[PDB]
Coordinates of C-alpha atoms in Angstrom, one line a residue:
Chain A
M1 CA -29.6 -6.9 40.9
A2 CA -31.2 -5.2 37.9
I3 CA -28.8 -5.0 35.2
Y4 CA -30.2 -5.5 31.7
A5 CA -28.2 -8.3 29.4
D6 CA -28.7 -6.3 26.8
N7 CA -30.6 -2.9 25.3
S8 CA -33.4 -5.3 24.1
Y9 CA -34.1 -5.7 27.7
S10 CA -34.6 -2.4 28.9
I11 CA -37.9 -1.7 27.0
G12 CA -41.0 0.0 28.7
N13 CA -41.6 0.5 32.4
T14 CA -42.6 4.5 30.8
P15 CA -44.2 7.2 32.7
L16 CA -48.0 8.0 33.1
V17 CA -48.1 12.7 32.9
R18 CA -51.3 14.3 34.2
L19 CA -52.2 16.9 31.6
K20 CA -52.7 20.7 33.1
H21 CA -53.7 21.8 29.8
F22 CA -55.7 19.2 28.6
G23 CA -59.1 17.5 29.9
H24 CA -61.0 18.6 32.9
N25 CA -60.1 18.5 37.0
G26 CA -56.6 16.2 35.1
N27 CA -59.0 13.5 33.5
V28 CA -56.5 13.0 31.2
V29 CA -52.7 11.7 31.8
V30 CA -50.0 10.1 28.8
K31 CA -47.5 7.6 28.5
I32 CA -44.3 8.5 27.6
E33 CA -43.1 6.0 24.8
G34 CA -40.2 8.0 23.6
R35 CA -38.6 7.1 26.3
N36 CA -37.3 3.6 25.0
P37 CA -34.1 2.0 23.8
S38 CA -34.9 3.5 20.2
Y39 CA -36.7 6.3 21.5
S40 CA -40.4 5.0 20.4
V41 CA -43.2 2.4 21.3
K42 CA -41.8 0.4 18.5
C43 CA -38.6 -1.5 20.4
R44 CA -40.9 -3.2 22.8
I45 CA -41.8 -4.6 19.0
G46 CA -38.5 -4.6 17.8
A47 CA -37.7 -6.7 21.3
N48 CA -40.3 -9.3 21.1
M49 CA -40.6 -10.3 17.5
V50 CA -37.4 -11.0 17.6
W51 CA -37.4 -12.9 20.7
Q52 CA -40.1 -15.1 19.7
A53 CA -38.1 -15.5 16.3
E54 CA -35.5 -16.9 18.2
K55 CA -37.9 -18.8 20.8
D56 CA -39.7 -20.7 17.7
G57 CA -36.3 -21.5 15.6
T58 CA -37.7 -19.0 12.9
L59 CA -34.5 -17.1 13.7
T60 CA -30.7 -18.4 14.6
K61 CA -27.4 -17.7 14.6
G62 CA -26.2 -16.9 11.0
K63 CA -29.7 -16.1 9.9
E64 CA -30.3 -12.5 8.7
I65 CA -33.2 -10.0 9.1
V66 CA -35.0 -8.2 6.1
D67 CA -37.5 -5.7 6.6
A68 CA -39.0 -2.9 3.8
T69 CA -39.4 -0.1 6.6
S70 CA -37.2 2.9 7.3
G71 CA -39.3 4.5 10.3
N72 CA -39.5 3.5 14.3
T73 CA -39.9 0.0 13.7
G74 CA -36.9 -0.3 11.4
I75 CA -35.1 1.8 14.1
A76 CA -36.3 -0.7 16.6
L77 CA -35.3 -3.8 14.5
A78 CA -32.0 -2.1 14.3
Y79 CA -31.1 -1.8 17.6
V80 CA -32.1 -5.1 18.9
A81 CA -30.3 -6.9 15.5
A82 CA -26.8 -5.0 17.0
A83 CA -28.0 -5.5 20.4
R84 CA -28.3 -9.3 19.9
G85 CA -26.1 -9.9 16.8
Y86 CA -27.8 -9.9 13.7
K87 CA -26.7 -8.7 10.1
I88 CA -29.7 -6.6 9.2
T89 CA -31.3 -5.3 5.6
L90 CA -33.7 -2.5 5.7
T91 CA -35.3 -1.6 2.2
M92 CA -36.3 1.2 1.4
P93 CA -36.2 4.4 -1.8
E94 CA -33.6 6.1 -2.5
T95 CA -35.6 9.4 -1.6
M96 CA -35.5 8.7 1.8
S97 CA -34.2 11.7 4.4
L98 CA -30.2 11.8 5.1
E99 CA -31.3 12.3 8.4
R100 CA -32.6 8.8 8.5
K101 CA -30.3 7.3 6.3
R102 CA -27.6 8.2 8.8
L103 CA -29.0 6.9 11.7
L104 CA -29.9 3.6 10.6
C105 CA -26.2 3.8 9.7
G106 CA -25.1 4.5 12.2
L107 CA -26.7 1.3 13.9
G108 CA -25.0 -1.3 11.5
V109 CA -27.5 -1.4 9.0
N110 CA -26.9 -2.7 5.5
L111 CA -29.3 -0.1 3.7
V112 CA -30.5 -1.2 0.3
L113 CA -32.2 1.7 -1.1
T114 CA -35.2 1.2 -3.8
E115 CA -36.1 3.1 -7.1
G116 CA -37.7 5.8 -6.0
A117 CA -40.0 6.3 -8.3
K118 CA -41.5 2.9 -7.2
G119 CA -42.3 4.2 -3.6
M120 CA -43.4 1.9 -1.0
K121 CA -44.1 -0.9 -3.1
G122 CA -40.7 -1.2 -5.1
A123 CA -38.5 -1.4 -1.9
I124 CA -41.4 -4.2 -0.7
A125 CA -41.1 -6.2 -3.8
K126 CA -36.8 -5.8 -2.9
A127 CA -36.9 -6.9 0.5
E128 CA -39.0 -9.7 -0.8
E129 CA -37.1 -10.8 -3.7
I130 CA -33.6 -11.3 -1.1
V131 CA -36.4 -13.3 0.6
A132 CA -36.6 -15.8 -2.3
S133 CA -33.2 -15.6 -2.8
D134 CA -32.5 -17.8 0.2
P135 CA -35.0 -18.8 2.5
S136 CA -33.0 -20.5 5.2
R137 CA -30.9 -16.8 5.3
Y138 CA -33.3 -14.0 6.1
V139 CA -36.5 -13.4 7.8
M140 CA -39.1 -11.3 7.3
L141 CA -40.7 -10.5 11.0
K142 CA -44.1 -8.3 9.3
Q143 CA -45.2 -6.1 12.0
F144 CA -48.7 -5.5 10.7
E145 CA -49.4 -9.5 11.1
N146 CA -47.0 -11.1 13.9
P147 CA -48.4 -12.0 16.8
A148 CA -45.8 -11.2 18.9
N149 CA -46.4 -6.9 18.1
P150 CA -50.0 -6.9 19.9
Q151 CA -48.5 -9.6 22.5
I152 CA -45.6 -7.7 23.4
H153 CA -48.5 -4.5 24.7
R154 CA -50.1 -7.0 26.4
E155 CA -47.5 -8.7 28.4
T156 CA -45.7 -5.0 29.5
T157 CA -47.8 -1.7 27.5
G158 CA -51.1 -2.9 29.4
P159 CA -49.7 -4.1 32.7
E160 CA -48.1 -0.7 33.2
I161 CA -51.2 1.4 33.1
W162 CA -53.1 -1.2 35.1
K163 CA -50.2 -1.0 37.6
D164 CA -49.1 2.8 37.7
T165 CA -53.0 4.0 38.0
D166 CA -53.6 1.2 40.2
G167 CA -56.8 -0.4 38.1
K168 CA -58.1 3.3 37.9
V169 CA -58.3 3.4 34.1
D170 CA -61.3 4.0 32.5
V171 CA -60.4 4.6 28.8
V172 CA -57.5 4.3 26.9
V173 CA -56.7 6.4 23.4
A174 CA -54.0 5.1 21.1
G175 CA -53.1 6.1 17.5
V176 CA -53.3 3.1 15.0
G177 CA -50.6 2.1 13.0
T178 CA -50.6 -1.8 13.2
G179 CA -53.0 -2.0 15.7
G180 CA -50.8 -3.9 18.3
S181 CA -51.0 -1.0 20.9
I182 CA -54.5 -0.9 21.0
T183 CA -54.8 -4.7 20.8
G184 CA -52.9 -5.7 23.6
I185 CA -53.6 -2.9 25.9
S186 CA -56.9 -3.9 25.4
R187 CA -56.4 -7.5 26.1
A188 CA -54.8 -6.6 29.2
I189 CA -57.2 -5.0 30.8
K190 CA -60.1 -6.0 29.6
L191 CA -59.2 -9.7 29.1
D192 CA -56.6 -10.4 32.2
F193 CA -57.7 -7.2 34.8
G194 CA -61.5 -8.1 33.6
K195 CA -62.2 -4.2 33.5
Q196 CA -64.8 -2.9 31.0
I197 CA -62.7 -0.1 30.0
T198 CA -63.4 2.6 26.5
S199 CA -60.8 1.3 24.4
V200 CA -60.7 4.2 21.9
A201 CA -59.0 4.0 18.3
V202 CA -57.6 7.4 16.8
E203 CA -56.7 7.9 12.6
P204 CA -56.5 10.4 10.5
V205 CA -60.0 11.8 9.0
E206 CA -58.0 12.0 5.9
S207 CA -57.6 8.3 5.7
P208 CA -60.7 7.5 8.2
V209 CA -60.6 3.5 7.0
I210 CA -61.7 2.0 10.8
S211 CA -64.5 4.8 10.9
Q212 CA -65.4 3.2 7.2
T213 CA -65.6 -0.5 7.2
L214 CA -67.6 0.0 11.1
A215 CA -70.2 2.2 8.9
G216 CA -70.1 -0.5 5.7
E217 CA -69.1 2.2 3.8
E218 CA -66.3 2.8 1.1
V219 CA -62.9 2.5 2.6
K220 CA -61.0 5.6 0.8
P221 CA -57.6 6.2 2.0
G222 CA -55.8 9.3 1.5
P223 CA -52.4 10.9 2.5
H224 CA -52.2 13.1 5.7
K225 CA -49.2 14.1 8.2
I226 CA -49.6 12.2 10.6
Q227 CA -46.9 10.0 10.4
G228 CA -47.3 6.6 11.9
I229 CA -51.1 6.0 11.8
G230 CA -53.6 6.0 9.1
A231 CA -51.7 2.9 6.6
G232 CA -54.9 3.0 4.4
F233 CA -56.3 -0.3 5.6
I234 CA -57.0 -2.5 8.6
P235 CA -54.1 -4.3 9.5
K236 CA -54.4 -8.0 11.3
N237 CA -53.1 -6.7 14.4
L238 CA -55.9 -4.4 15.1
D239 CA -58.2 -6.6 16.8
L240 CA -61.7 -5.2 15.6
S241 CA -63.4 -6.0 18.3
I242 CA -62.1 -4.4 21.5
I243 CA -62.7 -1.3 19.7
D244 CA -64.9 0.8 21.6
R245 CA -64.9 3.9 19.5
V246 CA -63.3 5.6 16.8
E247 CA -62.4 9.5 16.7
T248 CA -60.6 11.0 13.4
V249 CA -58.1 13.7 13.2
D250 CA -57.1 16.0 11.1
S251 CA -53.2 16.7 10.4
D252 CA -53.4 20.8 11.5
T253 CA -54.6 19.4 14.9
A254 CA -52.3 16.9 15.4
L255 CA -49.4 19.3 14.9
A256 CA -50.7 22.3 16.3
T257 CA -51.9 19.8 19.5
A258 CA -47.8 18.3 19.9
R259 CA -46.9 22.0 19.7
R260 CA -49.0 22.8 23.0
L261 CA -47.8 19.2 24.7
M262 CA -44.3 20.9 23.9
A263 CA -44.8 24.3 25.2
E264 CA -47.8 24.5 27.6
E265 CA -47.0 20.5 29.2
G266 CA -43.3 20.7 28.6
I267 CA -43.8 17.3 26.9
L268 CA -41.4 16.4 23.8
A269 CA -43.5 13.7 21.5
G270 CA -44.3 13.3 17.5
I271 CA -47.1 14.3 15.0
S272 CA -49.2 10.9 16.4
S273 CA -48.9 11.8 20.2
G274 CA -50.7 15.2 19.1
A275 CA -53.3 13.2 17.2
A276 CA -53.6 11.4 20.3
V277 CA -54.1 13.8 22.6
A278 CA -56.7 16.0 20.2
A279 CA -58.9 12.9 20.3
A280 CA -58.7 12.5 24.5
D281 CA -59.1 16.1 24.7
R282 CA -62.6 16.0 22.6
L283 CA -63.5 12.8 24.4
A284 CA -62.7 14.3 28.1
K285 CA -64.5 17.3 27.4
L286 CA -67.8 15.3 27.4
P287 CA -69.9 14.9 30.8
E288 CA -70.2 11.1 29.7
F289 CA -66.8 11.1 30.6
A290 CA -66.1 13.7 33.3
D291 CA -65.4 11.6 36.0
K292 CA -63.5 8.7 33.7
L293 CA -59.4 8.5 33.9
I294 CA -58.3 8.6 30.5
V295 CA -54.8 7.6 29.7
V296 CA -53.2 8.0 26.0
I297 CA -50.2 6.6 24.3
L298 CA -48.2 9.4 23.1
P299 CA -46.0 7.0 20.5
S300 CA -43.2 9.0 19.4
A301 CA -40.2 12.0 21.0
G302 CA -40.4 15.2 19.5
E303 CA -37.1 15.5 18.3
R304 CA -37.4 16.0 14.2
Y305 CA -37.2 18.8 11.5
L306 CA -40.3 18.5 9.4
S307 CA -43.8 21.0 10.3
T308 CA -43.1 21.4 14.4
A309 CA -40.2 22.1 16.4
Chain B
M1 CA -51.2 5.6 42.0
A2 CA -47.8 6.6 40.0
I3 CA -49.0 9.5 38.1
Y4 CA -46.4 12.3 38.2
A5 CA -48.4 15.8 38.5
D6 CA -46.3 16.8 35.5
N7 CA -43.0 16.2 33.8
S8 CA -40.1 17.7 35.8
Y9 CA -41.3 14.8 38.4
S10 CA -40.8 11.7 36.0
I11 CA -37.2 12.6 35.7
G12 CA -34.6 9.2 36.3
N13 CA -35.0 5.6 36.9
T14 CA -32.8 5.4 33.8
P15 CA -31.7 2.0 33.5
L16 CA -28.6 0.1 33.5
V17 CA -27.4 -1.9 30.5
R18 CA -24.6 -5.0 30.3
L19 CA -21.9 -3.7 27.8
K20 CA -20.9 -7.3 25.4
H21 CA -18.2 -5.4 23.3
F22 CA -16.2 -3.5 26.1
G23 CA -15.0 -4.6 29.2
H24 CA -14.0 -7.9 30.0
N25 CA -16.6 -10.8 30.9
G26 CA -19.2 -7.8 31.1
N27 CA -17.3 -5.5 33.9
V28 CA -18.5 -2.6 32.3
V29 CA -22.6 -1.6 32.3
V30 CA -24.3 2.0 31.3
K31 CA -27.2 3.9 32.6
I32 CA -28.6 5.4 29.6
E33 CA -29.7 9.1 30.5
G34 CA -30.9 9.6 27.3
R35 CA -33.8 8.0 28.9
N36 CA -35.3 11.2 30.7
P37 CA -37.8 14.4 30.2
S38 CA -36.1 16.2 27.9
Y39 CA -33.8 12.9 26.9
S40 CA -31.1 13.7 29.0
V41 CA -29.0 13.7 32.4
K42 CA -29.4 17.6 32.5
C43 CA -33.5 18.0 32.8
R44 CA -33.2 15.9 36.7
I45 CA -30.8 19.1 36.9
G46 CA -33.1 21.4 35.3
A47 CA -36.1 20.0 37.8
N48 CA -34.3 20.4 41.4
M49 CA -32.7 23.6 40.5
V50 CA -36.1 25.1 39.6
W51 CA -37.6 23.1 42.7
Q52 CA -35.2 24.6 44.8
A53 CA -35.2 28.2 43.5
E54 CA -39.2 27.5 44.5
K55 CA -38.6 26.3 48.1
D56 CA -36.3 28.7 49.1
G57 CA -38.2 31.9 47.6
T58 CA -36.3 32.8 44.9
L59 CA -38.8 31.8 42.7
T60 CA -41.9 32.5 42.7
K61 CA -45.4 33.2 40.0
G62 CA -45.1 35.7 37.6
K63 CA -41.2 35.7 38.0
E64 CA -39.0 34.8 35.0
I65 CA -35.9 32.4 34.3
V66 CA -32.7 33.8 32.2
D67 CA -29.7 31.4 31.0
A68 CA -26.9 31.8 28.8
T69 CA -26.9 28.4 27.5
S70 CA -28.6 26.7 24.8
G71 CA -27.1 22.9 25.2
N72 CA -28.9 19.9 27.4
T73 CA -29.2 22.8 30.3
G74 CA -31.3 24.7 28.6
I75 CA -34.0 22.3 26.8
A76 CA -33.9 21.1 30.1
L77 CA -35.0 24.3 32.0
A78 CA -37.0 24.9 29.0
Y79 CA -39.2 21.5 29.9
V80 CA -39.9 22.3 33.1
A81 CA -40.3 26.3 32.5
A82 CA -43.2 24.8 30.3
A83 CA -44.1 22.3 32.6
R84 CA -44.4 24.7 35.8
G85 CA -45.8 27.4 34.0
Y86 CA -42.3 30.0 34.5
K87 CA -41.6 32.3 31.1
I88 CA -38.1 31.4 30.1
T89 CA -35.5 33.4 28.6
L90 CA -32.5 32.0 26.8
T91 CA -29.4 33.9 25.4
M92 CA -27.1 32.5 22.9
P93 CA -25.5 33.6 20.2
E94 CA -27.2 34.0 17.0
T95 CA -24.4 31.5 15.0
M96 CA -26.7 29.0 16.6
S97 CA -28.0 26.4 14.6
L98 CA -31.4 26.5 13.0
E99 CA -32.1 23.1 14.7
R100 CA -31.7 24.2 18.2
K101 CA -33.5 27.1 17.5
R102 CA -36.2 25.1 16.5
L103 CA -36.6 23.0 19.8
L104 CA -36.6 25.2 21.9
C105 CA -38.5 28.0 20.0
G106 CA -41.0 24.5 20.2
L107 CA -40.6 24.7 24.0
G108 CA -42.1 27.9 24.8
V109 CA -38.7 30.0 25.3
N110 CA -38.2 33.5 24.3
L111 CA -34.7 33.3 22.1
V112 CA -32.6 36.0 22.5
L113 CA -29.9 35.7 20.3
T114 CA -26.5 37.5 21.1
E115 CA -24.3 38.4 18.4
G116 CA -22.4 35.7 17.5
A117 CA -18.8 37.6 16.5
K118 CA -18.8 38.2 20.7
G119 CA -18.8 34.5 20.8
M120 CA -20.2 32.8 24.5
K121 CA -18.7 35.3 26.0
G122 CA -20.9 37.7 25.0
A123 CA -25.0 35.8 25.4
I124 CA -23.1 35.5 29.3
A125 CA -23.1 39.1 29.2
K126 CA -26.8 39.9 27.8
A127 CA -28.2 37.8 30.3
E128 CA -26.5 39.6 32.5
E129 CA -27.4 42.6 31.7
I130 CA -31.2 41.6 31.6
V131 CA -30.7 39.9 35.1
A132 CA -29.8 43.9 36.2
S133 CA -32.5 45.7 34.6
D134 CA -34.9 43.9 36.8
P135 CA -33.2 42.0 39.7
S136 CA -37.6 40.6 41.3
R137 CA -38.1 39.4 38.3
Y138 CA -35.9 37.0 36.7
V139 CA -33.6 34.4 38.1
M140 CA -30.4 33.2 37.1
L141 CA -30.1 28.9 38.3
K142 CA -26.5 28.9 37.5
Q143 CA -25.5 25.0 36.9
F144 CA -22.3 25.5 37.3
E145 CA -22.7 26.4 41.2
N146 CA -26.1 25.7 42.1
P147 CA -26.1 23.0 44.9
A148 CA -29.2 21.8 43.3
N149 CA -27.5 20.5 41.0
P150 CA -25.0 18.0 42.5
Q151 CA -27.9 17.5 45.3
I152 CA -30.3 15.9 42.8
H153 CA -27.8 13.4 41.6
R154 CA -27.0 13.0 45.4
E155 CA -30.5 11.9 45.8
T156 CA -31.4 9.4 42.8
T157 CA -29.1 9.0 40.2
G158 CA -26.6 7.8 42.8
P159 CA -28.9 5.8 44.6
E160 CA -30.5 3.9 41.6
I161 CA -27.0 2.8 40.3
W162 CA -26.8 1.5 44.5
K163 CA -30.3 -0.2 44.1
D164 CA -30.1 -1.7 40.5
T165 CA -26.8 -3.1 41.4
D166 CA -27.2 -4.4 44.6
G167 CA -24.5 -2.8 46.8
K168 CA -22.2 -4.0 44.0
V169 CA -20.5 -1.2 42.0
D170 CA -17.1 -0.7 42.8
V171 CA -16.4 2.0 39.9
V172 CA -17.9 5.0 38.6
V173 CA -16.9 7.2 35.2
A174 CA -18.9 9.9 34.3
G175 CA -17.4 12.6 32.2
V176 CA -17.9 16.4 33.7
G177 CA -19.1 19.3 32.7
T178 CA -20.4 20.8 35.8
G179 CA -19.4 18.1 37.8
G180 CA -22.7 17.3 39.0
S181 CA -23.1 13.8 38.0
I182 CA -19.5 12.1 39.6
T183 CA -20.1 15.2 42.9
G184 CA -23.5 13.8 43.7
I185 CA -23.2 10.2 42.5
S186 CA -20.0 9.7 44.4
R187 CA -21.4 11.3 47.6
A188 CA -24.0 8.8 47.9
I189 CA -22.4 5.9 47.2
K190 CA -19.5 7.1 49.7
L191 CA -21.0 8.8 52.1
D192 CA -24.6 7.8 52.5
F193 CA -24.0 4.1 51.8
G194 CA -20.7 4.0 52.9
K195 CA -18.8 2.2 50.2
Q196 CA -15.3 3.0 49.1
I197 CA -15.6 2.7 45.5
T198 CA -13.2 4.6 42.6
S199 CA -15.1 7.8 41.0
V200 CA -13.4 8.2 38.0
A201 CA -13.6 11.3 36.2
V202 CA -13.4 11.7 32.2
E203 CA -12.4 15.1 30.3
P204 CA -10.3 15.3 26.1
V205 CA -6.6 15.0 26.5
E206 CA -7.1 18.7 24.5
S207 CA -8.6 20.5 27.9
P208 CA -6.9 18.3 30.2
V209 CA -7.4 21.1 33.1
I210 CA -8.8 18.6 35.8
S211 CA -5.5 16.7 35.5
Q212 CA -3.1 19.7 35.2
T213 CA -4.5 21.3 38.7
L214 CA -3.9 18.0 40.6
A215 CA -0.4 17.8 38.7
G216 CA 0.0 21.1 40.2
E217 CA 0.7 22.2 36.5
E218 CA -0.5 25.4 34.2
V219 CA -4.4 24.8 33.7
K220 CA -4.2 25.3 29.6
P221 CA -7.5 24.2 28.0
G222 CA -8.3 24.0 24.4
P223 CA -11.0 23.3 21.9
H224 CA -12.3 19.7 21.2
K225 CA -15.5 18.4 19.8
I226 CA -16.3 16.1 23.0
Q227 CA -19.8 18.3 23.4
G228 CA -21.0 18.9 27.1
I229 CA -17.5 18.2 28.9
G230 CA -14.7 19.9 29.1
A231 CA -15.6 23.3 29.8
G232 CA -11.6 24.6 30.3
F233 CA -11.8 25.3 34.0
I234 CA -12.7 24.0 37.6
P235 CA -16.4 24.1 38.1
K236 CA -17.9 24.8 42.2
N237 CA -20.1 21.9 41.5
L238 CA -16.4 19.5 40.9
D239 CA -15.5 18.3 44.7
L240 CA -11.8 17.6 44.0
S241 CA -12.5 15.5 47.3
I242 CA -14.3 12.3 45.7
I243 CA -12.6 12.0 42.6
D244 CA -9.9 8.9 43.0
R245 CA -8.7 8.9 39.3
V246 CA -8.7 11.0 36.0
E247 CA -8.7 10.1 32.6
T248 CA -8.3 11.8 29.6
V249 CA -9.7 10.6 26.4
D250 CA -9.6 12.5 22.6
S251 CA -12.1 13.4 20.0
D252 CA -11.6 10.5 17.6
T253 CA -11.9 8.0 20.1
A254 CA -15.0 9.5 21.8
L255 CA -16.9 9.4 18.4
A256 CA -15.7 6.3 17.5
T257 CA -16.2 4.3 20.4
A258 CA -20.5 6.4 20.3
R259 CA -20.6 5.1 16.5
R260 CA -19.2 1.0 18.4
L261 CA -22.2 1.9 20.8
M262 CA -24.3 2.2 18.4
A263 CA -23.2 -1.0 15.6
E264 CA -22.4 -3.2 18.5
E265 CA -24.6 -2.8 21.5
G266 CA -27.6 -1.0 20.1
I267 CA -27.4 1.9 21.9
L268 CA -27.8 5.6 20.5
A269 CA -25.6 7.4 23.0
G270 CA -23.8 10.9 22.4
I271 CA -20.5 12.2 21.6
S272 CA -19.6 12.2 26.1
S273 CA -21.0 9.0 26.0
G274 CA -18.6 7.6 23.9
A275 CA -16.2 9.8 25.9
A276 CA -17.2 8.0 29.1
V277 CA -16.8 4.5 27.8
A278 CA -13.4 4.7 26.3
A279 CA -12.3 5.7 29.7
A280 CA -13.9 2.9 31.3
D281 CA -12.8 -0.2 28.7
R282 CA -9.0 0.7 29.4
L283 CA -9.6 0.7 33.5
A284 CA -12.0 -2.4 32.7
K285 CA -8.9 -4.2 30.7
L286 CA -6.4 -3.3 33.5
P287 CA -5.9 -6.7 35.7
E288 CA -6.1 -4.3 38.7
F289 CA -9.8 -4.1 37.5
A290 CA -11.0 -7.4 36.6
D291 CA -13.0 -8.6 38.7
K292 CA -14.4 -5.3 39.9
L293 CA -17.8 -3.9 38.1
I294 CA -17.5 -0.7 36.7
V295 CA -20.6 1.7 35.8
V296 CA -20.5 4.6 33.2
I297 CA -22.9 7.5 33.0
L298 CA -24.1 7.7 28.9
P299 CA -25.4 11.3 29.6
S300 CA -27.3 11.9 26.0
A301 CA -29.4 10.6 23.3
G302 CA -27.8 10.6 19.7
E303 CA -30.2 12.0 17.6
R304 CA -28.2 14.3 16.0
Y305 CA -26.7 15.7 12.9
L306 CA -23.1 16.4 13.1
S307 CA -19.9 14.2 13.3
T308 CA -21.6 10.4 14.0
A309 CA -24.8 9.4 13.0

């Protein structure tokens, strides 16, 4: 057989494509996370956070999911909630784009808009109030600290990279949001496969908080246009111990690099995908990395309307 | 190994998911064509029409692709042209949505807008003029009659359905645009595997031209909102001989059914995906089809902004 009992179980097995106009002699290869149920790397963790919450008794028939997000992880949780029969509340500011509202209403989400002036703070409060209102009803899965998040990457994303390269991967380049990807991938290859690879974290030069921490310098975040990376703090799901190297990238370059992915490689991916590649391209063009296979996570699919396509 | 030398070669291997709120006892299973390079069933034929044109000498270094389309097949050709280093012209009316323009410019297409008043006729003329201007330069791959189109479905889409069901598929339900899908799938299972399945074509009740032809009645098309099916004529790539059954569906139902796919199954698919499912659900709820595995092509991914999400 090979028929998924629901859409959640179809996560991953995403492809590796070799880049032609990046790297040297084809040392740069990309893994298309756009090719997922809800079209992002995130529905891997959408799937396993719900599954883990089930297995350990925190999520049960009748019980409902609450989360203060509207990005790839909201969409991801939505599809699994729809797929598995959970009611879901996502809180976000009333200033969110009609687009994202429409997409999430479509997936059967109860949309609680919070005050726009309260920014993201205010959506987090409103989620948290709903949870205090009845703690036997609503569950917050908490992507930033939930081990289920990096656990899925250790069990699927990581092994898939091992498999499809035949143990030949030397370098892994992954933008950091929750840190879940890099953490899980790196644990799989270094610890379950026993290969001493170079794991490279990627962050906005505008918010170089991983770089600052490790240098022992004032953590100072700021705004950037690289959606889904550069949270402005070190997440619990970032395991600083498996990070070999930290590469910073600027918005403009992430943008331009995602543009190039389209017109020169024919790969529709997101801003963070560009960020990831510019970092890899830089590494790949250093002689110390000449004869080394570098693998890059492209987190999302390009189909948007705001800076780029 | 398993690293694609370019994005074109990553086509297919798309998943089968079982529906919970459709069919009976889970006799309805869906194959997610959203999970492709350019995010549609079409980049399967984007890939193989170019490959075939290469193998037989019609497409060569320097030579350029021209096509009067802007739907899934334009996007598909774009990604392969970008992936393989071909210049591409797509003609379409100047009335196309900024969205589709932006997406295609992004993939490195030369966009030739034709008069809006000339409708689709006028884009076809303008393509055809460019081809007459220099026949050693520009090539029209012609999805409606190109055998490479159904050939890819015989070689990939069909086998994948065979494999993942373990020879247990009984019914195949597929909306008709070019006919390429149904034709290729059905040839694979009936002729290469030797299983006497029921191939079901799906069309808008508003343009029931397959139904009319076979009844020997006046072919009379009309407008419908089911994007990518119901062309208003019988394509050469529709092999009427392998069609067992023709199911008509209305726009409203296709729409509503795609809405249900989202909120009840957590599957983001397109209008034509809804059309496909309502037809399958109807068949699946007939006792003659009770103990039969029905497989449905979901051609596209939902991420749009016009009627639905």
